[PDB]
């Protein structure tokens, strides 16, 4: 799971 950056 990727960290939210947008």
């Amino acid at each position: 799971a990727e960290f939210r950056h947008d």
Partner: antibody
Amino acid sequence: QATLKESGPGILQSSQTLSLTCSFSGFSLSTSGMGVSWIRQPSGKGLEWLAHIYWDDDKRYNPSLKSRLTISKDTSRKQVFLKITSVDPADTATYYCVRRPITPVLVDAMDYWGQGTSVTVSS
Amino acid sequence: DVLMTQTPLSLPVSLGDQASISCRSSQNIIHSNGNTYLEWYLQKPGQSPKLLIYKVSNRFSGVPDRFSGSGSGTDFTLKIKKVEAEDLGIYYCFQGSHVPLTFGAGTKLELER
């Protein structure tokens, strides 16, 4: 620029609930792209990321701690909160709240850190 | 979890020397949005960490140009030229791409004798 300042109990016993508060100034957490993370330094060493809250109340957690952590905010009091249930001695650490904006903000990184608050789990 | 391995863990230098810290991740820290969220932080004695470098090689405002960061994929380097007393402390690399966000163990920059 921004200022963050953590506060906590100082000391508490294992199995109790740790409530941390972070007071912030110099920016609005409700502004698009703004968010705040909580970081800790277990014992005197290392750094561990705990949780993050975004301007729109979206929330992300260290998956191994998800069940014990709750992050929340009250922008009307210029405060962010972290709660950790059922603490044990491994939770002894200095806790930092830190600003970490994402896009639209150009600097996506932990750019402003609080001075931190020491927490000791002990009976 | 993305393991961030820093080399060396202790780095003794003389004032004026250049210092180099390596950071290797267990996986590619590029994000699906094309950005690589690798940051460097400095924790001086008695202080909280402060930001030095973000997205691999961008110096945070106020950080002297003798600090520089580079790399890609899984291999990253912080270089500090002209080391002075105010640079001494613990340097951490950090990845902001994959949950959980993770730090390196910390590299202590210290004096030679």
